[PDB]
Write a protein that binds this ligand. Structure first.
Ligand SMILES: Nc1ncnc2c1ncn2[C@@H]1O[C@H](COP(=O)(O)OP(=O)(O)OP(=O)(O)O)[C@@H](O)[C@H]1O
Ligand SMILES: Nc1ncnc2c1ncn2[C@@H]1O[C@H](COP(=O)(O)OP(=O)(O)O)[C@@H](O)[C@H]1O
Ligand SMILES: Nc1ncnc2c1ncn2[C@@H]1O[C@H](COP(=O)(O)OP(=O)(O)O)[C@@H](O)[C@H]1O
Ligand SMILES: [Ca+2]
Ligand SMILES: [Ca+2]
Ligand SMILES: [Ca+2]
Ligand SMILES: [Ca+2]
Ligand SMILES: [Ca+2]
Ligand SMILES: [Ca+2]
Ligand SMILES: [Ca+2]
Lengths: 54, 373, 372, 375, 372
């Protein structure tokens, strides 16, 4: 969980420190394993739903 | 008994007794002989003086032997002769502790008062190591067996040193010492361990106090807890790219697929049409003028099993060695191809099918309805 | 048409089977057990020596001897008993019509190599044989050809860097510290809690305790402070006579001899310094992929947390621009056998076989020239 | 020289307690460490019938007592009886108050840790000593001989241990411990006396068999020739008188009993003998220091007091070692008390006063100070 | 009136003594040993750091470190321990009374020279000091003013051309293999006979084996053929614990790393053609006497047969219109000290000292303008 929280802070600091200025209120959305929205999934070439499930 | 001391005695069997301990020094070999009636403290002093003669006078270029009655080596019997009967030994009383207490006279030589001064520091040993001041020159006179030590300080003047040597030479003829008396000149940090025995608890500067600690010669990671800064991510985007793959990839290539335990060539109408559950080897020849050259790529599908990828690696190494070792290899998995490998087919896409060959099922039939991304 | 045999003879275990298969058929410990008590009941089934799992099942009344001590073979009659047991009793096959692939640790004395030939063509009369390096078989079993292999079993622990499918002989390093030494160290440090283990059967029990209840701490001093401050790390084990023992900090002190060899009194450095100096003795251009392909093999690399600790120690030693990937497959206990099984089953392999004819015209020196 | 001290040295071994003052040449109080309790019905009221007897007065009344050793193979098991023996040796033997004397204690290597914390706790809380220290017995045995380099085989009543020391530095990885000593030899002699028909079962009979072992047993130079000599003739038989006047005769049992030290398979132990234990202790030391460890074999403890054990020890190590090396074995006649003599040396050394575990260090650090200060 | 001191600081063997002597008074190895176990017998002379030949005596219970590696001082505090042991324990003199001559490696960095000057004048308080070069003192001890010097000790091998009594910096060439790497290669090639030498304590044993039993073969292939066929060159050595090892073809294979660096995986050139590469970098007119004066210096020139092999290898690839002669004095392991002892005792050297007051109003920078 400390990986999760300090990764949230690191993702925020990665947003403000980019050279091309972007929107400071760029939203951080937490995604769980096995429950992914299609917005996350659509960037992956060849998603398998039953990859992690044995 | 309490104040144990060493005294030089002439080298003969008649000088030996059974109630003391003896050290026979023969250069590179030192023999320690312990009497049967000798006690604990003079055995410990014999060990200490023998290790001092080894490690300080000879700098470790010696070997110390410890012996008792009946176990004398050939060296002691060769030097001293055949062994007579020993004339026993007196019990260790307190009068010879007082005799050992009166053996040395520590004198001072100093021009700190503006004039010549030879004065008595002490006549009662064990002396104090702190009494040896670093700005003066001291004299120890154990001249009964013929030893006079001139100890020089680091911050002593030259005329103090010459006066100390002159006074030590003057001690020869005044008190009527015998005509073999050695005047040993000793600087700070270079003291003879026959000089050291008259001092209460001599301390070398790099001694071990207590049990001590090991050095261990090897250490594990003890990195400090730094917070990580994320601005190094999008900045400093270093990249190496390719080193010799400058061609656009028309070339002349051969593609093999591994089935079971053997590779076969694929059909030449089907270059960029791979199976996801198979393993492939691609040999590629440079037509480019950069000294020609050959590339062997080892492509491994994601659905491919362990036997196929292991056989692909072994056949890749065998194909490298049977061409003389001139080509260089590049392991590649599905999804992680370089830009040069995608350019081998000449503007064609890489078609990846589903399924493949196996040792027990062979080639899988394709599905009726197929979807491609 | 004849199926070749693959027989990985380790210091602690023997993994034997047929080429082309995915798993070894016979896995059994390489011990020879002999009776030490007086037999009073006549007839029955008393034998002069017991080999393998039969010696494990009767180990209360047997003294147990390992033929292999720190990689080299000390007893050859017992090793012949091991080979006879794995041919005739385990695989139940006649070895005079099957070529046999054998494995060997690198920087071994040369006198073993012809001697392993000297039994195989004279007693069992194999048609062909081959000797392969264990590390290149482990690297082949991962599907890789360039990388560094840390092979750590029961006898030795060696780092081998391999480039283009050939090991570099000027950078192979050997460390005589493996699972038997960790077992002996765990026997030493279990006396602190009052448990005495001196018998070879008790050595087998402590080896089982080491397999079930040991792990590598990510940092040693903080874990020692945690074990001192509470009792959350304590675990219980049941001895076969029903006695229950409890171990605390000794769970993680026994793998730490891998990273700090001074616990058992060795001046030599740990496995991470051994990997770093093995990488540093290679050429400058090929150091990039040696750090990125760092596979692990053997049963001694099966502790929890060994890969994270190894990446932590290598990362502190390497330059920060380098990328470190410690590769720990779940099948790494049998990776030597899998690489040998795939390598023996190939159709292009049947000319590197050292057959009978060149052996008995060349003598016991053909193995030094055909097996590189 | 060395400065005067008022310390106490108490070698509390498995069989005997040897207590005395530091600086003396001999321990003042030597007595067996047993606690005796009566097992019969007391019908005569009066005359001070105690509930428990400790030390030499338990030996005088051993017929009507059951005797217990609190120390078994070096480990203290019954702490109440150990506290009783410590109270007896402080108050009834040395006749001193422990509040103004530092105490030096002895211990075998490779004991459990809890023995060391409980020794710390009963010395500091019950007796209120101002200082305390525990030391390894073989280090003291090498102190008594006057040497620095050597391997020490110390064999008492419960523990037989080999410790190698080069210069002042010990090698902990090469230390060997074997639970084969005078207890096991006494029990084996109790077993093999049944071959002649003499049955000894009780604890007082065990003390009688221990006296027989001390007064009659010896180590044969070679076993099989001595068996043939004992079988052929009757010159090796010797007699002993029991305290009720019965006379027994023993033959080969004189030398079969200490042979268990060289062949532990007589009592079912698969471990090797003391010669192989010494040889494998030398082999785990690295290659540069074997030559000095061969020539400085030091034997200490009461179990090393058989006649002929040094010659047999010489022959077996000479057989095991290569022929170019010279093997010398140091067996002083005072080796029964050499642990106490080395404790008397070490407590009086001027370097040692900065290593006492004081009272305030124990008060701030608990009983776990002993593993950071001692060894 | 006072006598100067000469101290040649080798990378593995330091030499010291008084000026005007035909031999160094003290030869002892430049090591610093530290204990690796705990000293439980207190009050019996345990030290935290054993320096020099004393550390060679009790080398089993110590870890050894070399303060000078590859001819250059790296660890400075240990070098102060070496110098303190040299002055106070070994030579038994006060440094305040005696001037001191030191020797340095060719192409020494300037900061090491300044730091040598600073610890020489501050810590020990010498009244005078001078720094010289290894190879020019070797050439002066040979009685020449022009020649090539092959100085090969324990750390590095230097080829230094000297013309008119001064070196040529553009042609001084450094080859980084010496007796340390020969010792390490001998530990490598004794493993096939079954002997293992891993720690720094028994590296000295392998160094003694290399010194007592090694030779340079005049031709390598026929020597290997006769070693393979017969057994007339196999000889035994007695390890100091009593075991006896035997060595065969490894007796001559271990000096051959100097002529073939590929035996240890080093891609550089052998010792014979790097002298050719140095002498081609010199001017065309001065090569006639430079070829004729082939001075060999250092301890690893003391193999038997190295001079004849060097004569053959230079004569093979130099042109046939000139004569090659190799000189090898019997005192060539002490020749730097002999040149320093001649240099310090001259009647023109008292003005070339760096006195204390010149360092006082000059700082640690006058060493460049005077030692030149
Ligand atoms: N007879 C010999 N045969 C072979 N090697 C020898 C012999 N005598 C000495 N050596 C080796 O020579 C080296 C020491 O030589 P030398 O004292 O000239 O070198 P150094 O001054 O310490 O080194 P460097 O000049 O590189 O700093 C050691 O490696 C030693 O093993
Ligand atoms: N789960 C485990 N955890 C820790 N160690 C293990 C585990 N399984 C096996 N080992 C160790 O691995 C060693 C054998 O490893 P392996 O290399 O497979 O056999 P060999 O060494 O005979 O080739 C044994 O000594 C055993 O102690
Ligand atoms: N003369 C002797 N011969 C053989 N054994 C002896 C002799 N004297 C004492 N012993 C044995 O020594 C053992 C105890 O010796 P010691 O080490 O002094 O006591 P502890 O073991 O209590 O320290 C006793 O068990 C006794 O059997
Ligand atoms: Ca006396
Ligand atoms: Ca003065
Ligand atoms: Ca497939
Ligand atoms: Ca290639
Ligand atoms: Ca293995
Ligand atoms: Ca004892
Ligand atoms: Ca030199």
């Amino acid at each position: 969980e400390e990986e999760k929280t300090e990764a949230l802070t690191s993702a925020k600091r990665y947003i403000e420190t980019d050279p091309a200025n972007r929107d400071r209120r760029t939203p951080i959305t937490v995604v769980k394993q096995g429950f992914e929205p299609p917005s996350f999934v659509g960037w992956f070439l060849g998603w398998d739903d039953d990859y992690w499930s044995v | 008994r309490r104040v144990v001391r060493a005294t030089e005695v002439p080298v003969s069997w008649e000088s030996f007794n059974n109630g003391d301990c003896f050290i026979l020094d023969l250069g590179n070999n030192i023999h320690q002989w312990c009497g049967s009636n000798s006690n604990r403290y003079e055995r410990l002093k014999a060990t200490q003086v023998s290790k001092g003669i080894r490690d300080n006078e000879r700098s470790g270029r010696a070997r110390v032997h410890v012996s008792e009655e009946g176990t004398e080596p050939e060296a002691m019997l060769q030097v001293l002769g055949p062994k007579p009967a020993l004339p026993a030994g007196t019990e260790d009383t307190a009068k010879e502790d007082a005799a050992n207490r009166k053996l040395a006279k520590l004198y001072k030589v100093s021009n700190g008062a503006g004039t010549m001064s030879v004065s008595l520091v002490a006549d009662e040993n064990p002396f104090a190591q702190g009494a040896l001041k670093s700005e003066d020159c001291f004299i120890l006179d154990h001249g009964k067996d013929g030893k006079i030590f001139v100890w020089k300080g680091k911050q002593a003047n030259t005329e103090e040193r010459k006066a100390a040597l002159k006074t030590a030479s003057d001690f020869i003829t005044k008190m009527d010492y015998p005509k073999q008396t050695q005047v040993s000149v000793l600087p700070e940090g270079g003291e003879t361990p026959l000089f050291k025995q008259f001092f209460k608890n001599w301390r070398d500067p790099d001694q071990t106090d207590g049990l001590g600690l090991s050095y261990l010669s090897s250490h594990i990671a003890n990195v400090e807890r730094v917070p990580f800064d994320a601005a190094t991510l999008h900045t400093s985007t270093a990249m190496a790219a390719q080193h010799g793959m400058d061609d656009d990839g028309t070339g002349q290539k051969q593609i093999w697929r591994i089935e079971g335990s053997n590779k076969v060539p694929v059909d030449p109408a089907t270059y960029g049409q791979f199976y996801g559950g198979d393993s492939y080897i691609i040999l590629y020849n440079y037509r480019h003028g950069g000294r020609q050259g050959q590339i062997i790529y080892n492509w491994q599908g994601a659905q491919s099993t362990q036997d196929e990828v292991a056989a692909s690696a072994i056949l890749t190494a065998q194909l490298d060695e049977e061409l003389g070792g001139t080509p260089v290899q590049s392991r590649v998995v599905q999804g992680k191809e370089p830009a040069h490998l995608m350019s081998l087919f000449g503007g064609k896409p890489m078609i990846i099918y589903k399924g493949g060959t196996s040792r027990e099922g062979g080639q899988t039939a394709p599905a009726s309805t197929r979807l491609f991304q | 048409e004849t199926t070749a045999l693959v027989c990985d003879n380790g210091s602690g275990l023997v993994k034997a089977g047929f080429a082309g298969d995915d798993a070894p058929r016979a896995v059994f410990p390489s011990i020879v057990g002999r009776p030490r008590h007086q037999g009073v009941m006549v007839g029955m089934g008393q034998k002069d020596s017991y080999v393998g799992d039969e010696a494990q099942s009767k180990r209360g009344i047997l003294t147990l001897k390992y033929p292999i001590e720190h990689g080299i073979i000390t007893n050859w009659d017992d090793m012949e008993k091991i080979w006879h047991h794995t041919f005739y009793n385990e695989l139940r096959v006649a070895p005079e019509e099957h070529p046999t692939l054998l494995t060997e640790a690198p920087l071994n004395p040369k006198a073993n190599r012809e001697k392993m030939t000297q039994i195989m063509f004279e007693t069992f009369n194999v048609p062909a044989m081959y000797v392969a390096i264990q590390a290149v078989l482990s690297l082949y079993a991962s599907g890789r050809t360039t990388g560094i292999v840390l092979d750590s079993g029961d006898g030795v622990t060696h780092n081998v860097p391999i480039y283009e499918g050939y090991a570099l002989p000027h950078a192979i390093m050997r460390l005589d510290l493996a699972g038997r030494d960790l077992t002996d160290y765990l026997m030493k440090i279990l006396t602190e809690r009052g448990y005495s283990f001196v018998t070879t059967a008790e050595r087998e029990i402590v080896r089982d305790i080491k397999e079930k209840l040991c792990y590598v701490a990510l940092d040693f001093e903080n874990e020692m402070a945690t074990a001192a401050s509470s009792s959350s790390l304590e675990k219980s084990y049941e001895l076969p006579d029903g006695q229950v023992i409890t171990i605390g900090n000794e769970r993680f002190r026994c793998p730490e001899t891998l990273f700090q060899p001074s616990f058992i009194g060795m001046e030599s450095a740990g496995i991470h310094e051994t990997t770093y100096n093995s990488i540093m003795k290679c050429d400058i251009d090929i150091r990039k992929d040696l750090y990125a392909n760092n596979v692990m093999s053997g049963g001694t690399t099966m502790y929890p947390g060994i890969a994270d600790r190894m990446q932590k120690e290598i990362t502190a030693l390497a330059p920060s621009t380098m990328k470190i990937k410690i590769i720990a497959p779940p099948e790494r206990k049998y990776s030597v056998w899998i690489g040998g099984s795939i390598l023996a089953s190939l159709s292009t392999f049947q000319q590197m076989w050292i057959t009978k004819q060149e052996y008995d015209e060349a003598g016991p020196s053909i193995v030094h020239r055909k097996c590189f």
